[PDB]
């Protein structure tokens, strides 16, 4: 084979349709389904799989008590077939760690996992299922990464890493990897002030990443990466439509080179597709908590600070629970453009439901279409009562 090259553009997005759904929590009521969190989706040339961080126990077991924690070090990155539940008998382990990212470059897969204490943390980069290279911690405070699919171009796969206070000016680095080796890295530049958990997609040469600002605002930062040059810039999405959670109620005028205030020290991972008049933004529906999920069509959201929605689609009702979301694309599909897709984590259990001692999620995913299709919401559908 050869490496994937990001030469096609993005398809016109008129509406979204169901791509996949595992119903992991419903199934897990009476089967050996693993407790997971922080899912993402990724596709190889002939297969799509779900990825998630496992807590090392089934939902129904007794070790699910206390899985609310983000790291226990019993945590690992696993992968299982699209729309099947993450069961104990069908999952493959990619690597071990409490934070991760992965992707396929056209020849093989790269996976990165971060493990260890909050101080002496470390990252191990795997390629073709073997460890290749490692990165130690530099700011000594929770080394962390994307929790999403990475995007490669001609073998080069840029990855965003953060190290430092989550309520302060943490540092940031971008590493450029090839076959698991480190070719270069850069300190973060541009006007974004704080970056965590980037969601990236490639298009017509170049990678766009939507990331989160957990320090000062509701206008998510964007990193624009040139994988050939191995250079980058950053800014915020100008649109007055705010996309983080919790967030302020929308203003008339947004901001571009500075975060938009009112909700400090918080936020949720999310995504956007930035393409001029073909621009779409994702966000929760409630401004107070992680519930609901919708897609809005907002022309020129990246640069127009007075732009507003002209269309949209509901994915999850505000009556349902939501979670982290992010983007992905199948870069080996036939056609003259890439079909944009995204996923949403649906969180059940703690911290919102106190009737159980665990936390878990179901996965729902959507892909775009050029047709105008109808809409339906997609609750995880589990009865919490059945676990009580």
């Amino acid at each position, epitope marked *: 084979r050869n490496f994937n090259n990001l030469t096609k553009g993005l398809c016109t997005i008129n509406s979204w349709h169901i791509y996949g759904k595992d119903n992991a929590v419903r199934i897990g009521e009476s089967s050996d389904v693993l407790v997971t969190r922080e899912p993402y989706v990724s596709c190889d040339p002939d297969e799509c799989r779900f990825y998630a961080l496992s807590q090392g126990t089934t939902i129904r077991g007794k070790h699910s008590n206390g899985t609310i924690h983000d790291r226990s070090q019993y945590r690992a990155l696993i992968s299982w077939p699209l729309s099947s539940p993450p069961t104990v008998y069908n999952s493959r382990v990619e690597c071990i760690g409490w934070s991760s990212t992965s992707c396929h470059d056209g020849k093989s897969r790269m996976s990165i996992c971060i493990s260890g204490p909050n101080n002496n943390a470390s990252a191990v980069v795997w390629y073709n299922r073997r460890p290749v290279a490692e990165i130690n911690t530099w700011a000594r405070n929770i080394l962390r990464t994307q929790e999403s699919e990475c995007v490669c171009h001609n073998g080069v796969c840029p990855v965003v890493f953060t190290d430092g206070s989550a309520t302060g000016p943490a540092d940031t680095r971008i590493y450029y990897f090839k076959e698991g080796k480190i070719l270069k890295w850069e300190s973060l530049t541009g006007t974004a002030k704080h970056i965590e958990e980037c969601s990236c997609y490639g298009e017509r040469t170049g990678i766009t990443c939507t990331c989160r600002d957990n320090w000062q605002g509701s206008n998510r930062p964007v990193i624009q990466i040139d994988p050939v040059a191995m250079t980058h810039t950053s800014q915020y999405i100008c649109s007055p439509v705010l996309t983080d959670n919790p967030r*302020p*109620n*929308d*203003p*008339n*005028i*947004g*901001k571009c080179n*500075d975060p*938009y*205030p*009112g*909700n400090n020290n918080n936020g949720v991972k999310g995504f956007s597709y930035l393409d001029g008049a073909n621009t779409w933004l994702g966000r929760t529906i409630s401004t107070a908590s992680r519930s609901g999920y919708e897609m809005l069509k907002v022309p020129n959201a990246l640069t127009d*600070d007075r732009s507003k929605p002209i269309q949209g689609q509901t994915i999850v009702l505000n009556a349902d629970w939501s979670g982290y979301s992010g983007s992905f694309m199948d870069y080996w599909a036939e056609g003259d453009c890439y079909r944009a897709c995204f996923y949403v984590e649906l969180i059940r259990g703690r911290p919102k439901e106190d009737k159980v001692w665990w936390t878990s999620n179901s996965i729902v995913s959507m892909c775009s279409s050029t047709e105008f299709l109808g809409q339906w919401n997609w609750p995880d559908g589990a009865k919490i009562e059945y676990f009580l």
Partner: antibody, heavy 120, light 108 residues
Framework: QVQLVQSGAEVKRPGASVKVSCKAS????????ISWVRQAPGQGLEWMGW????????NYAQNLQGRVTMTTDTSTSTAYMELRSLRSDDTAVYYC??????????????WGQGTLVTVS | DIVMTQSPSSLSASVGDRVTISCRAS??????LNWYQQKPGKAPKLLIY???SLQSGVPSRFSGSASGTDFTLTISSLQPEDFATYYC?????????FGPGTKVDIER
């Protein structure tokens, strides 16, 4: 915690100028715009003007032009406004406020306590 | 001259008694209208911006909407603490202007 702190009350005789400070805290000073309003006793809020966050271009209320100037000191995170050639009817409480876009006006959310200036 | 009026200029109501205050712009200012609350001796507080967006920290009892150039602020129940002069601000274009304000007093 975002706060705006203004200079205390002063009394001037007509023809004098007055400079009123407003110190910012809790946020990056240079990222937000500053504006002023004044409230004469028994009156509503009269907009004085608005100064842009990054370049200080300013915009003065027309009825005040020729008597008013605005400036900021980014090293002390302090905004200043000055009126010249004061008259007895310029008695008012002057308030400083912060505006969300720092490059456009859309919603002044933080207010100082107000500075009373008496002209007599 | 960006012109706006308030109506009622004054009113009163018993605590717990729901009220509405209106503002009318001459110009087609669209969504660019904010509402402020001022108590004696204090700098004005914000309640609503961009016509209907509530400011975080402001009680849920406050809400508003607009049609044409007519904007309203209303409440659900009337709080013992919300007797104040309310003002509309036209943020649409400089010079920015305020209406004269509406005073809500306590019914006696």
């Amino acid at each position: 915690q975002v706060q705006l702190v203004q200079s205390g009350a002063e009394v001037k005789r007509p023809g004098a100028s007055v400079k009123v400070s407003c110190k910012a805290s809790g946020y990056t000073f240079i990222s937000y715009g500053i504006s002023w309003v004044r409230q004469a006793p028994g009156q509503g809020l009269e907009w004085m003007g608005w100064i842009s966050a990054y370049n200080g271009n300013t915009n003065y209320a027309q009825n005040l032009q020729g008597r008013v100037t605005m400036t900021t000191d980014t090293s002390t995170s302090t905004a200043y406004m000055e009126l010249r050639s004061l008259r007895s009817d310029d008695t008012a409480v002057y308030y400083c406020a912060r505006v969300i876009p720092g490059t456009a006006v859309d919603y002044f959310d933080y207010w100082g306590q107000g500075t009373l200036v008496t002209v007599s | 001259d960006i012109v706006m009026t308030q109506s009622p200029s004054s009113l009163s109501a018993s605590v717990g008694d729901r009220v509405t205050i209106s503002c009318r712009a001459s110009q087609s200012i669209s969504s660019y209208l904010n509402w402020y609350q001022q108590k004696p001796g204090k700098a004005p507080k914000l309640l609503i911006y961009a016509a209907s967006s509530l400011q975080s920290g402001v009680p849920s009892r406050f809400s508003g909407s607009a049609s044409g150039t007519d904007f309203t602020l209303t409440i659900s129940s009337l709080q013992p603490e919300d007797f104040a002069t309310y003002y509309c601000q036209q943020s649409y274009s400089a010079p920015f202007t305020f209406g004269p304000g509406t005073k809500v007093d306590i019914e006696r």
